[PDB]
Amino acid sequence: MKLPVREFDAVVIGAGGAGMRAALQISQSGQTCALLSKVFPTRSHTVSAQGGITVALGNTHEDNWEWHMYDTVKGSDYIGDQDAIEYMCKTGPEAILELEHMGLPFSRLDDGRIYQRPFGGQSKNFGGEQAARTAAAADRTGHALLHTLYQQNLKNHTTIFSEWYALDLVKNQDGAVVGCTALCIETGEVVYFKARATVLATGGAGRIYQSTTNAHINTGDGVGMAIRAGVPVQDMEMWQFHPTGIAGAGVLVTEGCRGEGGYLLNKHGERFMERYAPNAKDLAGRDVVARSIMIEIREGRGCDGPWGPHAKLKLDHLGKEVLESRLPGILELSRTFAHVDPVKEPIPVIPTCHYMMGGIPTKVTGQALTVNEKGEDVVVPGLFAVGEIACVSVHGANRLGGNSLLDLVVFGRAAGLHLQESIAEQGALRDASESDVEASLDRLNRWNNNRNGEDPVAIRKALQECMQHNFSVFREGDAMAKGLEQLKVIRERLKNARLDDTSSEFNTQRVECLELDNLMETAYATAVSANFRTESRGAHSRFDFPDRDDENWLCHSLYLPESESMTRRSVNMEPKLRPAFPPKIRTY
Amino acid sequence: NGVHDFILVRATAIVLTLYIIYMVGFFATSGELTYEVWIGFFASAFTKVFTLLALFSILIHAWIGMWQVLTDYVKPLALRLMLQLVIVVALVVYVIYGFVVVWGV
Amino acid sequence: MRLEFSIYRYNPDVDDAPRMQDYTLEADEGRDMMLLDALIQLKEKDPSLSFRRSCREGVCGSDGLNMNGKNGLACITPISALNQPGKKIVIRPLPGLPVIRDLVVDMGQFYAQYEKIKPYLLNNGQNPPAREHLQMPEQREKLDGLYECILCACCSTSCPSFWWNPDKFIGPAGLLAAYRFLIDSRDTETDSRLDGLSDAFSVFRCHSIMNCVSVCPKGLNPTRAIGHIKSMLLQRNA
Amino acid sequence: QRPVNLDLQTIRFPITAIASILHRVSGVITFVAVGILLWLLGTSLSSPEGFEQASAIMGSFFVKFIMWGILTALAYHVVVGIRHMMMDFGYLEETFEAGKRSAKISFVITVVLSLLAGVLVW
């Protein structure tokens, strides 16, 4: 060891929703715990969440967790694992009331109960009448949730290493994950965090695209670290494009706008969602509403102006009072980034890269999964994942509105709840050798020595443009084969990219270069996967295979990092408290 | 404590605002300021008492106030305590010197 | 059309003291952009320029800067609001905090004052709710204008009283948070809290300068909040 | 050890901020003025002679100037101080608009007193 070693029971890489809940839980469970985060905890993407948390509280009308389980399984287009989805919807209510008790400032009904609003994909009686089960604080829920979880961590004296950048996982000579190396952004010091349990909770990667609702810091760091560690990623081709991003800006306006009574219009003023989805209308599944708006545009029924091609989102008829009360957040957003006052005029929107369905495969416990040579599941000793970085999978091929926050809290909790048994079950892990740790540093050492290489700025731009034109809402076999080839090229250029800033006192340049490596691995695993799936399900939509193929593709796709090839995993269809929902035709 | 200061300062302010109104009252309506109409005003019991009352008010108000200023700008403990000593002795002098000036009129 | 900047620079390993450096950026004339846009582009040209940013939509509170003399968020300050013919756009770190590097400050004391006021629900557990704590819409409104704070540090770093006693005075941001728990109906420790704010510095260092109000990117009003706290304090200890 | 941006000259200050920095200065000045005012008042009472000696001093133009400043500083501290107290008692709103509005009216009320002060001393 020529590097400081900091030892903990658990090291939680990431301090957003899932990571902070998990930290909080692990800690109260007796164990030591380090919470790492490359930004100050409350700046994590979770802060920007608006709509709310979907959960069968049954405050707004009498509800039932199984109704929510149905909505999810259907919304996922039947590759969501039913046992996990059952766990989520069923646990939900208690896990969420728990937050209210932590002080989370939810909005209120007249009787004093948590306010709930209608949202995309929410029915009573297994596909029946429209429901309203998304609990919210105005349209600032993510902000309320995150700040509450931070305060809870403050109260609880959690150990938080703020503004430390995790570099790469560390593997013992047994293939078990025994912590990771991290770079302290302020001082430049590099350290080895040594843990019996490394929990990855690093969020999404919408920045592999050219336009996204995601923060600048969403660079799939977790996906890269995992891939480089030899750990497979799953369903990487399922990328959810939110129907209503602000045109020519990418900044999201909540699906809560449509849940409160707004609808989408095209250039002729037709509420075109009644055509594409007769029953659910503007509250149909997200993948569907996304494609619909994109079709309307692709046939000259889109609108135009300083924003670019877009659909009109009409709100004005809800009245100033309701808008300012239930949706004040998008009021400022629409005014600021669209120069449109939603109280008078419609908001210019267009589907935008939003959420990463894929990620590291995990059990409900949070334990990361890999497959052996026989294709069977094996647990990666020492590795865990929670939140967007994880593919449990509770969202399958299309996530439901409000279901991510639910996820963060439920599975962040669960992971801590089950950490003791997980550690005991895996047994003592052998120590990492000095060369094991040295290996983690390879990626960083390259950059520190490359002075005359390629410009990373151009490489990133090339990457994002590529994903944008080839792996967007609609995909075709030809484009995907060419995009994939350009990626191989782009990725070569990157192995020779240069770090133009050499300093060590808060050097943001080194960070952004380290991040780019992960943008790459993620973008790549996505492309290789999107090619592999020769069907159309949820968000994934190919023209050359327009049908959902339940005979060959009722499963997850798995990207094996070592051989850079694809494979498959079963979708679980065995709940415990009710019979499985059989795959049927999915229309809204 | 702070709530005490907060109240004391504002209380003395009300007293001193009444004193100023009363003193500006005299000045604004007296005209020919002969040595005799001046000394006559300051022989009055009302004027003697109001004035001493006003001097105490400054002692308290000014002390609290100057303290706030010092504890923003004057960091070194030594120098600050020294300055407070002056400021306070000064204030106390004010009240005593007033007791000497008006009592003898 | 060309844009000219003057930006604060400092790197302990190179710079003896801080310094203002000149920058030029070619800007698409027709289109308008945000200061953070410019900053990101300047970094392509000079990769050494360090600053913070994340959400780019004025919600996370990362990129607080003193722009043309006044605090705010780069991600939502339009170039057109800072640009005047013949004068450079001047960009400096938030005032009063230690400067780590270039435009990045050490938020240490800011967070410290935040923790000091115990910014978490304290409910003594008696008479538990059957499910969620019941809070009537009327009570929930009292949180409005208080819970939205992004801890961006704009208000506190523009307050003189905070400049002079950053560790004794709580500052606008913090006192706002304190009030946010002082009027939360679900918080049962109101008196205990108030007793911790009765010294001469915590709350009373505030003169109503009102810098706090004019800078808050979320349009919140720390002055009024500190106002309410003083009432409660008098109500209790007077 | 680290630098800090506290170069007062590089910062915008609103009218409300001006208003109180002056309130502070006017206060400190008034603290000195009370001794000077007492020193004068004491003279003008000790004897008939001392009084003449005082109104003699008050004749000097240089004295008349200082005397007007002293009265203007006090005028300010009182007006702006009452503004302050009015907020503390709820007669004034603590919004930013209401702050600016009242800070201006304070300045005007002060200029009017400052004149009536010169007239008292001229």
Ligand SMILES: *Cc1cc2c(cc1C)nc1c(=O)[nH]c(=O)nc-1n2C[C@H](O)[C@H](O)[C@H](O)COP(=O)(O)OP(=O)(O)OC[C@H]1O[C@@H](n2cnc3c(N)ncnc32)[C@H](O)[C@@H]1O
């Ligand atoms: C983008 C978005 C998403 C969103 C939303 C609005 C927006 C603009 N509104 C939602 C809503 O109303 N309801 C809902 O269910 N979901 C909504 N979403 C999606 C949701 O916000 C996200 O899916 C969710 O917030 C993900 O949370 P998670 O905890 O998984 O991720 P994170 O909050 O972004 O946290 C990431 C943390 O990891 C740290 N990090 C990342 N990389 C590193 C490295 N390299 N080293 C150390 N730390 C790292 C970050 O610092 C951060 O703390």
Ligand code: HEM
């Ligand atoms: C007569 C001699 C006086 C002196 C020497 C004096 C001095 C001071 C001083 C030193 C301060 C503190 C300044 C600061 O905190 O920046 C202050 C504040 C104040 N002054 Fe006076 N003052 C006098 C009279 C008055 C009067 C007649 C009023 C009536 C309005 C008044 C009203 C106030 C108020 C309300 C404050 C509150 C400042 C605070 O604590 O927030 N003062 N004064």
Ligand SMILES: Oc1c(Cl)c(Cl)c(Cl)c(Cl)c1Cl
């Ligand atoms: O110390 C102070 C400074 Cl520097 C300023 Cl700028 C202001 Cl406005 C005030 Cl009120 C005080 Cl006390």
Ligand SMILES: O=C([O-])[C@H](O)C=C([O-])O
């Ligand atoms: O529309 C939203 O508010 C947000 O996009 C919700 C989810 O679930 O992601």
Ligand code: SF4
């Ligand atoms: S109160 Fe306003 S200025 Fe202060 S930290 Fe919060 S958002 Fe920033």
Ligand code: F3S
């Ligand atoms: S800017 Fe500062 S002094 Fe008070 S009203 Fe304000 S916190």
Ligand code: FES
């Ligand atoms: S970058 Fe998030 S607040 Fe400006």
Ligand code: NA
């Ligand atoms: Na995921």
